[PDB]
Automatic annotation (TrEMBL), chain A:
One of its GO terms (molecular function) is identical protein binding. GO terms for biological process: positive regulation of TOR signaling. Keywords: Metal-binding. It comes from the Bacteria. The keyword Membrane does not apply. The chain holds residues 6 to 137 of 163 of the full protein. The keyword Metal-binding applies. This is Probable gliding protein (MglB). It comes from Thermus thermophilus (strain ATCC 27634 / DSM 579 / HB8). Mg(2+) binds at residues 80, 93. Residues 12-105 form the Roadblock/LAMTOR2 domain.
From TrEMBL, chain B:
This is Probable gliding protein (MglB). Residues 11-104 form the Roadblock/LAMTOR2 domain. GO terms for molecular function: guanyl-nucleotide exchange factor activity; identical protein binding; metal ion binding; molecular adaptor activity. It comes from Thermus thermophilus (strain ATCC 27634 / DSM 579 / HB8). GO terms for biological process: positive regulation of TOR signaling. Mg(2+) binds at residues 79, 92. Keywords: Metal-binding.
From TrEMBL, chain C:
The keyword Iron does not apply. Mg(2+) 6 binds at residues 105, 113. GDP binds at residues 12-17, 65, 125-126, 128, 155-156. This is Probable gliding protein mglA. Mg(2+) 4 binds at residues 63, 65. SUPFAM superfamilies: P-loop containing nucleoside triphosphate hydrolases. Mg(2+) 5 binds at residue 88.
Amino acid sequence: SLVLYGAPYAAAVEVLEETLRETGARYALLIDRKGFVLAHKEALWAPKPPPLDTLATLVASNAAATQALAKLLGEARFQEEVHQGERMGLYVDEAGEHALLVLVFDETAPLGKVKLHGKAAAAALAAIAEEAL
Amino acid sequence: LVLYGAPYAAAVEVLEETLRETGARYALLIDRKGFVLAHKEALWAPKPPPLDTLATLVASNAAATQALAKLLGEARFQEEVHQGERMGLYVDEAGEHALLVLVFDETAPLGKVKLHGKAAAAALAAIAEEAL
Amino acid sequence: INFKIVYYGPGLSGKTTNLKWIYSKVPEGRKGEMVSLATEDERTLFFDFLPLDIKTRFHLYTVPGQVFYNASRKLILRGVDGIVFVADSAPNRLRANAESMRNMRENLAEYGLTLDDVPIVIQVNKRDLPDALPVEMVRAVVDPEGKFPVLEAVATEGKGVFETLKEVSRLVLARV
Ligand SMILES: Nc1nc2c(ncn2[C@@H]2O[C@H](COP(=O)(O)OP(=O)(O)O)[C@@H](O)[C@H]2O)c(=O)[nH]1
Ligand code: ALF
Ligand SMILES: [Mg+2]
Ligand SMILES: [Mg+2]
Ligand SMILES: [Mg+2]
């Protein structure tokens, strides 16, 4: 379990906000592996997101299945995932053992920065997830 | 989708050639319900991990990633390459009703993996559709 | 505060029918959207998902029941807080019931959990079938020692559905 409130909640949100600015993504979420939205932020320029609980259960079960495939093959883990459509994409990475960072971005976002700040955001959130164990 | 007879023979040759041309360990065509329609292993490779398990997981993953795409207004995302330290997986659609999967290790060149996996999938898509 | 509830059981036992009846009766304001990853015959392939209010949030999941989908069924059990085991009443599905309960215990043991570790409620579903088996016979197969609440149901009609959910909710709460 991982219950996020108080100062760690506030620090997680500040990470999500900073990541949105540095990357140009539309939505940033910290979700646990169980599928629960633990913190989310939306870029104020962006349209309303799709239902975020739908997004997060789909993303957590994608990550569940791909981690199981890895373990099937003898690996601890595959790398961060970038799902890329014609306009929309998703950057999904680990925020420690119990959670995932999710970035939703469109054509306006530079992929280099998504990956680059996405990875640092993942690492900052794993640090924060530990202080809420 | 059920592959038997000549379409099945045709599928297996595409699978053998892709393994030869890529250096990959195993190659499968699975349906979107996670059933293995045809597969081949490289003679040099170890016995595979359980392939029915591998296939239910890939098809579950695909249903979830396909729902993510539609959620975002996309028809679909691109083919996947999952890379561990040594092992990897390539997955790509083979028409609307099937997925090609390659499992490979660090001796298989990623550019060949990607280049022949993509051709294998289009070839298998053709076999699949003409099987109906 | 977030709880996960998994509806478990053999193929076609009525797990998805449960979440759909619940979804149809819970008012707008107290539920999110239902997600289903299902084949065209609408058998569940990966999961159903239904978030609702009863702050505290309950995330309801179902698992695919086919024996050959154990790999995705077990991903869904991760982090479960409570389980509703939906048993079918049909005479020819009794051993399927036992196989599912055995499979349930096995998957739980991979996460280091015993059946004592997780609240569980047995729902004996499809009470409307003309040839339905006695409730106690179904129960004696999936729960020989009667350690678990049992509730009867006709999920296609709503009967037992909310009472099963309140029962498992009750147990998950009393567990904290
Ligand atoms: N007669 C009867 N049929 C039911 C009942 N509950 C579900 N069904 C039917 O059983 C079939 C399988 O239901 P579903 O929830 O999809 O099964 P599952 O999701 O695999 O457990 C569907 O046709 C349902 O209408 C019930 O209580 N009585
Ligand atoms: F059709 Al099922 F679990 F057997 F959804
Ligand atoms: Mg072989
Ligand atoms: Mg179902
Ligand atoms: Mg036994």
